[PDB]
Design a protein around this nucleic acid. Structure first.
Lengths: 206, 141, 145, 80, 60, 67, 63, 143, 70
RNA sequence: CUUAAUUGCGAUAACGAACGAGACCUUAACCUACUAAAUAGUGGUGCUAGCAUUUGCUGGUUAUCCACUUCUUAGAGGGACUAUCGGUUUCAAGCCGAUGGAAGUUUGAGGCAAUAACAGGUCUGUGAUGCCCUUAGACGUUCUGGGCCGCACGCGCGCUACACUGACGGAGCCAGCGAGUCUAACCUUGGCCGAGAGGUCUUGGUAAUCUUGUGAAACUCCGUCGUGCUGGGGAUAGAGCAUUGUAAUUAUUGCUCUUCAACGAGGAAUUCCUAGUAAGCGCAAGUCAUCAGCUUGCGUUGAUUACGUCCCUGCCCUUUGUACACA
């Protein structure tokens, strides 16, 4: 890491996992492989955000919102619900203890568990209301790679808000529960719930 | 006199003035390091620039940072953009042009307004609410 | 920095101060579930008898709980001036008294009855089932008493 | 007494000066003019003056007992 | 800046629309060290209708 | 949305018929060009005007100019 | 269960009951050169691989 | 390399310095720490018990040597929170300054701070020594 | 309130059985195990955390994740 | 066919012009250039120290001085133009992406915002006052106080927790729009005592200066409690220490102390809204004697979801009907 000693005592520990690999608060960001079709670009994992904060300027463009980090979309959907419908610092620190549980359980890359937690968690086909005869019956349609990531982190936060609501269960505990139940299909997260019936219709109405 | 390239950094409505002279390389804010600014998580967010390059070019310059007014979080992006624009200024005043060339190319290949300018600021609140376009709940009757 | 276990003489719903005091909670805010023994007035009793704000309820000595009795009911005796009471400056001759559990209920309906015998809006309209502390209810009032 | 100076000068062509014409026009109607003859005269007065836009909206009744709007404007009158 | 914000229409009905007839006072300054001739000349000549100057003699 | 008004449109087309032997295909220079030949009052419109001829003339030499 | 992943290649106008759908023509990577016409839901551009749960299907304008 | 004072560990420093007020026995108290809550807005009491009286005194000396001088009027606004009166909105109403006065007024009888001329309370030379003395012990746990 | 609001030494024993070999072991997680409340479970994992068993990677109010003794 | 738009091109029995729009006025952005500024501030230096005591790390004397104009101030100027290229359309206005840039949705954005229609609002700001009533026994007015502040039932305007993304404790302790006395009591600091408030002793400011770096809440640090009409909300009620004021009840509020209300996620329904936007939040103010939960804004912290269509609503426009014109 090439020795650095001057006036202000910069801990060589912080300079270690920083002045070399600018990953997370000590989380290997490098490597990672695509386990599904496309998702590239609409799913970052190439911009090593050390913290959960950034100068968010992506909603000012249609697809530049997709080129936005996938880890940032998580704390964006976490910084809401009346009391905290704003203020990012809150969800930011509690989001640290979440991927730290995943650090002890299966370790891997914290960002690798979130990749499977968007591949088979983002609704393949969302149901919309279309006409036919007698009344108006709903019908789903193929969803794009961007609406799989978008609609995913949206339901992922609904099952985590009702998980830390009326339940002694803490935030980082329910946020880890959300990423872990999103291992590859546990049928426990509120997210998979609504998606399961989107496939129910994306079958008997194809 | 003392050779210091005085610069600055701010956002929304805050104040920060950073200096980059020829000294023993430090980062004291009125006499405190950037490694104690808090809020713990935003502390690692302000080191980020000194990570993709390394505090190796910061082992030969005295940084004099100071912040007042605005907001606590608004000062976060303030202190970092004041010393980032201050170092690139020492590479145009006491360093060569091709060195400062791949320096700013390492900031725009990540882009976080370190040297650029943020043009976002509060709008003209309307005569009906607390925000801009915001209009009172018009339930008609 | 010290784990607290001690013994096992914890009694569910223990009685003291002439009331069915509730348990399964910290001694400090446990006594605050009674009408008379104040939230911060019960707080005074804890510290002014030798009890920490880190401790809980389930042990201690019956000796400490006894001085706790003579302190809340007798303010002019044990350090409890007049500002700490809800009936300060008394109402007889420059002294003071506080309502403790089975004392608030009594002075409550009894002091308002002597003011209703002098014929005043205060207790007479509280007797009619209406407002008394001065306010506007031309809009609200859809449930009533 | 001794620190007050009360001057007086001339009026800069009340033709293009709407404020000074409104003065004598104030009593021109309180003198005994009319409606279509009264307002059409004060306007053609600013025409010989060489003005760009002249508007004079007359709001009142015209022997119809109905007070509507009458456009006594002509030229280049903008609103911006 | 002294901005008197009043309700748009002067009667009390209509919809929700607020006005702000604004007017600001400009304040410049000329720090010098001159006599009384060119100084008492600044308060007598070179005056525009509705203009004043804040001159304070000596520095204590 | 960006599509300049009529006032400026008519003005610049006349400059092409009385300045063709000159007129540069650059705007940063054609800026001060329109400043001396014509009389304007707007700083904002000033820019839209000069940026108009740089635009027109560039695609003018496309051959057939029915305009 | 046969899952198909078809990459968008052309757009044919945005339809929608309220205006939230588009008539999109794709081409699955699974044996390319076969362009099957379908419909999308959210933000769409050419070269985007889809997750349609069907091989042979097609619908016209949505109302 | 050396050190200053603003380069100290935030809250673990203010906790070890309050324990010093009680130790030397140079605090001088007429008796009122337990009954008040240092604010006309504060509702609930501490989960610490033995403190917040000496914790209050240590914090004032901090923003005295880092700037010019301070009193208790600036502290009534500096330590003035928002009091929620039920559904009735909050308010930045000045807390209580009875503590604040006898706080550094007793630290005057000893020689921790001094009386600044014209206004506020300045820090004396015997105070600078004692203040950067506790900074040394909290840094003997650091570098 | 019902089960895990008091102390009674007995609980502390079956808990010394929850802390070790446990991947995810924190204050309020062992409180869900029906045993002890998040009140005394606090000073408990602050007298057994200094022993090494539980490894602290977090440390603020409420949330604080611990690893097994490895 | 395009645009925030009759913006306009393009198209042609029309030609070319006028207003609205745009432009423009107005604010903040980018302004290491200018007047330069200690009524804003940054640095070195005479002079005193803490800690270095071997580079120095940092406060202090609005004259110890000198220097900058960066931070800040604000007048004169400068800038930006889909402009650079490729696809797409008749090789149109334009569109779009990538660009650097302060900025590619007027740049965000307010004030103006055609003609007309209303039998819109106000006779209650109008000493504008048509028509009318009233003047010794007044509908002008004054004194006491109510009534304006009196509520089975209610629309609508905000708010509140309901909990654990939460309740409390000290602590890390950050603003901008601000706003302030003459024959006087307006901003009032430094202050001693005091539960808040205040008594009492004073100077400073007539204002980038004194007040006062709005030292605010928000949020972070390490803890206390543990989903219980509980310590969640402090209901409700009562003795009590004081400000305004002739006088405080039906009381104006601060606050000390005691008690502890529906509410377990809000009924069919339904408002604002496409980025520093939503929402959370306070300050000074407008208010104004005290009293504001209202509103101006402003700072402060800061999402998600389409970029399309006319489905439901509001409006616009031809093809067209007419036996309707107080429509």
């Amino acid at each position: 890491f090439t020795p650095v000693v001057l006036a202000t005592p910069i801990p060589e520990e912080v300079q270690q996992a920083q002045t070399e690999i600018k990953l997370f608060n000590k989380w290997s960001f490098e490597e990672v492989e695509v386990k599904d079709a496309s998702l590239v670009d609409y799913v970052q994992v190439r911009q090593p955000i050390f913290v959960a904060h950034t100068a968010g300027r992506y909603a000012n463009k249609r697809f530049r919102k997709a080129q936005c980090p996938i880890i940032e979309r998580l704390t964006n959907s976490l910084m809401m619900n009346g009391r905290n419908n704003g203020k990012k610092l809150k969800a930011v620190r509690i989001i640290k203890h979440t991927l730290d549980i995943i650090n002890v359980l299966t370790d891997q890359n914290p960002i690798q568990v979130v990749v499977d937690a968007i591949t088979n968690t983002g609704p393949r086909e969302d149901t919309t209301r279309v006409g036919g005869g007698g009344a108006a019956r709903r019908q789903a349609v193929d969803v794009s790679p961007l609406r799989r990531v978008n609609q995913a982190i949206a339901l992922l936060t609904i099952g985590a808000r009702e998980a830390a609501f009326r339940n002694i269960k803490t935030i980082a505990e329910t946020l880890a529960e959300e990423l872990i139940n999103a291992a590859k299909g546990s049928s426990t997260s509120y997210a998979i719930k609504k998606k399961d019936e989107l496939e129910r219709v994306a079958k008997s109405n194809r | 006199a003392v050779p210091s390239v005085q610069t600055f950094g701010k956002k929304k409505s805050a104040t920060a003035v950073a200096h980059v002279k020829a000294g023993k390389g430090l980062i004291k804010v009125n006499g405190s390091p950037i490694t104690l600014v808090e809020p713990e998580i935003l502390r690692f967010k302000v080191y980020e620039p000194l990570l993709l390059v390394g505090l190796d070019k910061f082992s030969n310059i005295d940084i004099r940072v100071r912040v007042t007014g605005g907001g606590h979080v608004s000062q976060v992006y303030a202190i970092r953009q004041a010393i980032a624009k201050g170092l690139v200024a020492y590479h145009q005043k006491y360093v060569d042009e091709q060195s400062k060339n791949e320096l700013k190319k390492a900031f725009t290949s990540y882009d976080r307004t370190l040297l650029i300018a943020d043009s976002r600021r509060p709008e003209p609140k309307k005569f009906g609410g607390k925000g801009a376009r915001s209009r009172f709940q018009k339930s008609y009757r | 920095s010290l784990v607290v276990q001690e013994q096992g003489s914890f009694q569910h719903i223990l009685r003291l101060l002439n009331t069915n005091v509730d348990g399964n909670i910290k001694i400090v805010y446990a006594l605050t579930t009674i009408k008379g023994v104040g939230r911060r007035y019960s707080n005074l009793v804890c510290k002014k008898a030798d009890v920490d704000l880190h401790k809980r309820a389930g042990e201690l000595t019956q000796e400490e709980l006894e001085r706790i009795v003579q302190i809340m009911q007798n303010p002019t005796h044990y350090k409890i001036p007049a500002w700490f009471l809800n009936r300060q400056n008394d109402i007889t001759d420059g002294k003071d008294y506080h309502t403790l559990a089975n004392n608030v209920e009594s002075k409550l309906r009894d002091d308002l009855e002597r003011l209703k015998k002098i014929r005043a809006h205060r207790g007479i309209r509280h007797f009619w089932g209406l407002r008394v502390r001065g306010q506007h209810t031309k809009t609200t009032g859809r449930r009533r008493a | 007494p001794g620190t007050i100076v009360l001057y007086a000068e001339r009026v800069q062509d009340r033709g293009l000066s709407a404020v000074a014409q409104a003065e004598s026009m104030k009593f021109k109607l309180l003198n005994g003019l009319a409606i279509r003859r009264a307002a059409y005269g004060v306007v053609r007065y600013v025409m010989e003056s060489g003005a760009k836009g002249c508007e004079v909206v007359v709001s009142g009744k015209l022997r119809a007992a109905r007070a509507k709007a009458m456009k006594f404007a002509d030229g280049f009158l903008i609103h911006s | 800046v002294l901005k008197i914000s009043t309700r748009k229409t002067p009667n009390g009905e209509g919809s929700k629309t607020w006005e702000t007839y604004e007017m600001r006072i400009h304040k410049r300054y000329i720090d010098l060290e001159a006599p009384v001739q060119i100084v008492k000349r600044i308060t007598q000549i070179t005056i525009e209708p509705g203009v004043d100057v804040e001159v304070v003699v000596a520095s204590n | 949305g960006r599509v300049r008004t009529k006032t400026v449109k008519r003005a610049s087309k006349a400059l092409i018929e009385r300045y063709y032997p000159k007129l540069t295909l650059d705007f940063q220079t054609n800026k001060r060009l329109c400043d001396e030949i014509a009389t304007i009052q707007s700083k904002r419109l000033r820019n839209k005007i000069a940026g108009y001829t740089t635009h027109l003339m560039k695609r003018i030499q496309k051959g057939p100019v029915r305009g | 269960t046969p899952v198909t992943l078809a990459k968008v290649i052309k757009v044919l106008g945005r339809t929608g009951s309220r205006g939230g759908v588009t008539q999109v023509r794709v081409e699955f990577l699974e044996d390319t050169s076969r362009t099957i016409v379908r419909n999308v839901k959210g933000p769409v551009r050419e070269n985007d691989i889809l997750v349609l749960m069907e091989s042979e299907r097609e619908a016209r304008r949505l109302r | 390399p050396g050190v200053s004072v603003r380069d100290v560990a935030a809250q673990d420093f203010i906790n070890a310095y309050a324990s010093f007020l009680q130790r030397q026995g140079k605090l001088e108290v007429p008796g009122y720490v337990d009954i008040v809550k240092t604010s006309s807005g504060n509702e609930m009491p501490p989960q610490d018990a033995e403190g917040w009286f000496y914790k209050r005194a240590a914090s004032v000396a901090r923003h005295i040597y880092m700037r010019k001088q301070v009193g208790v009027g600036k502290l009534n606004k500096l330590y003035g929170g928002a009091k929620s009166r039920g559904v009735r909105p909050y308010k930045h109403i000045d807390a209580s300054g009875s503590i604040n006065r006898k706080v550094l007024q007793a630290l005057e009888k000893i020689g921790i701070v001094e009386i600044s001329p014209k206004g506020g309370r300045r820090i004396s030379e015997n105070g600078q020594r004692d203040l950067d003395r506790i900074a040394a012990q909290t840094l003997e746990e650091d570098e | 309130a019902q089960h895990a609001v008091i102390l009674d030494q007995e609980k502390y024993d079956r808990i010394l059985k929850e802390v070790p070999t446990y991947r995810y072991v924190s204050v309020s997680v062992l409180v869900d195990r029906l045993k002890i409340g998040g009140s005394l479970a606090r000073i408990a994992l602050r007298h057994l955390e200094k022993e090494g068993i539980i490894k602290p990677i977090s440390k603020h109010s409420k949330q604080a994740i611990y690893t097994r003794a490895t």
